[PDB]
Curated annotation (Swiss-Prot):
Keywords: Acetylation, Annexin, Blood coagulation, Calcium, Calcium/phospholipid-binding, Hemostasis, Isopeptide bond, Phosphoprotein, Repeat, S-nitrosylation, Ubl conjugation. A motif ([IL]-x-C-x-x-[DE] motif) lies at residues 311-317. It comes from Rattus norvegicus. A pair of annexin repeats may form one binding site for calcium and phospholipid. PANTHER family: ANNEXIN, ANNEXIN A5. There is a cross-link at residue 26 (Glycyl lysine isopeptide (Lys-Gly) (interchain with G-Cter in SUMO1)). The modification N6-acetyllysine is found at residues 67, 73, 76, 94, 98. This is Annexin A5. Monomer. Binds ATRX, EIF5B and DNMT1. The modification N-acetylalanine is found at residue 1. The modification N6-succinyllysine is found at residue 287. Belongs to the annexin family.
């Protein structure tokens, strides 16, 4: 079953919480410990409630006050923690599309790992919040098959899980084989239709059969046949089909990979999944990397930032 690491706090008193926060910031300096200890122990819904209580009591904006009092990565984490759950993905996508450049990894990460219901919710929130259509903006900042696959995924029309059809599994596996390894070049359109619209249960069967037929895992063929953002997107899609938790766990691993850390990604994953499947992510993480996610973060981060991340993540055993 899917499980997160953050849940509603029992005996929740938003008014009292707003007072704690006001006390942590009022006056010289800031009580960062008090702030993180509280917010990481409250669900996203409760945080929004605290924000309204804070404003009702003081006429001050909670998030604006924390941005004034805080700084660095700790601030970025607190700000993300404050973003309403329903708007967070839309927010990160908007951030990925701002300016002339484009943050492809974010578009790929979110669009490949969100369910059709989540994408429908995101598309709506995005347009309501920014006054523009998500698909349109994505199309505007992307090109080629990478763009097309993203558009297919944005339609949020992946087939639901229905009775498994053996002939169909064989048919699709063989089709991918002819579209890639057996073709001079690649029939990208076939990979996009099959990997982007077929059901999760169907594709899991297809991946197994594909290996049996070709001798290659679908991930290997993808690397052999494609490159650029298309390659990254197809891998993310395949990995999410196998296991969203596993994909995100791997996403975290390569974010604390080597000199320095990809904090933007580290924060987004921890925050976005904290109330969905961060627990599952932890398990898949421990199994695949022989170390708990906790240890990874602990040795890659520091300060209040580190403290907050560790409280949200949890599972120091694992
Ligand atoms: O009790 C739980 O453990 C549990 C309960 C919750 O409902 C759910 O958590 S939730 O937070 O999402 O609410 C979660 O459900 C598990 C489920 O218990 C697992 N069952 S087990 O594998 O037998 O142990 C499992 O179930 C899914 C299977 O993985 C999936 O197989 S495959 O796609 O990987 O090949 C299988 O899919 C069926 C599908 O349901 C059928 N639909 S139909 O309406 O009958 O047509 C149809 O499409 O066939 C496929 C394949 O059938 S076959 O496997 O018999 O050959 O069944 C799925 C399912 O029943 O949900 O995983 C879920 C989710 O796991 S997770 O931990 O939340 O990630 O845990
Ligand atoms: O004399 C005091 O009463 C007083 C002095 C000290 O500076 C400080 O006490 S201390 O013990 O902490 O050292 C405390 O500062 C008050 C400040 O006087 C208040 N100003 S008031 O609204 O006019 O009463 C208020 O300040 C906040 C206001 O939004 C604004 O202040 S002001 O210039 O209008 O007077 C200012 O807003 C900044 C914002 O903080 C910035 N944030 S960011 O980090 O850069 O992202 C940014 O958004 O710019 C705006 C606007 O700047 S502009 O004015 O130059 O255009 O600062 C706000 C703030 O400091 O939070 O509250 C503080 C703190 O009050 S508390 O009761 O201790 O919590 O009191
Ligand atoms: Ca202060
Ligand atoms: Ca301090
Ligand atoms: Ca700041
Ligand atoms: Ca852009
Ligand atoms: Ca780029
Ligand atoms: Ca080929
Ligand atoms: Ca081609
Ligand atoms: Ca390649
Ligand atoms: Ca590192």
């Amino acid at each position: 079953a899917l499980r997160g690491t953050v849940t509603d706090f029992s005996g929740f008193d938003g008014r009292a919480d707003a007072e704690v926060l006001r006390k942590a910031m009022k006056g010289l300096g800031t009580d960062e410990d008090s702030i993180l200890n509280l917010l990481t122990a409250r669900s996203n819904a409760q945080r929004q409630q605290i924000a309204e209580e804070f404003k009702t009591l003081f006429g001050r904006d909670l998030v604006n006050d924390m941005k004034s009092e805080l700084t660095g990565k700790f601030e970025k984490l607190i700000v993300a923690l404050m973003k309403p759950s329903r708007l967070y993905d839309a927010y990160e996508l908007k951030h990925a599309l701002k300016g002339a450049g484009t943050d492809e990894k974010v578009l790929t990460e979110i669009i490949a790992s969100r369910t059709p219901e989540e994408l429908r919710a995101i598309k709506q929130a995005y347009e309501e919040e920014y006054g523009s259509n998500l698909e349109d903006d994505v199309v505007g900042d992307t090109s080629g098959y990478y763009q097309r696959m993203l558009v297919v995924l944005l339609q949020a029309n992946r087939d639901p899980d229905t009775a498994i059809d053996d002939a169909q599994v064989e048919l699709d596996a063989q089709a991918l084989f002819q579209a890639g390894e057996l073709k001079w070049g690649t029939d990208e359109e076939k990979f996009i239709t099959i990997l982007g619209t077929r059901s999760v249960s169907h594709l899991r069967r297809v991946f197994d059969k594909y290996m049996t037929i070709s001798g290659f895992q679908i991930e290997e063929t993808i690397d052999r046949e494609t490159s650029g953002n298309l390659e990254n997107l197809l891998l993310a899609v395949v990995k999410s089909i196998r296991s969203i938790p596993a994909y995100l766990a791997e996403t975290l691993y390569y974010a604390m990979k080597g000199a320095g850390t990809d904090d933007h990604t580290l924060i987004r994953v921890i925050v976005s999944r904290s109330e969905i499947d961060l627990f599952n992510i932890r398990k898949e993480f421990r199994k695949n990397f022989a170390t708990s996610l906790y240890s990874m973060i602990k040795g890659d981060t520091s300060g209040d930032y580190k403290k907050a991340l560790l409280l949200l993540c949890g599972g120091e055993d694992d």
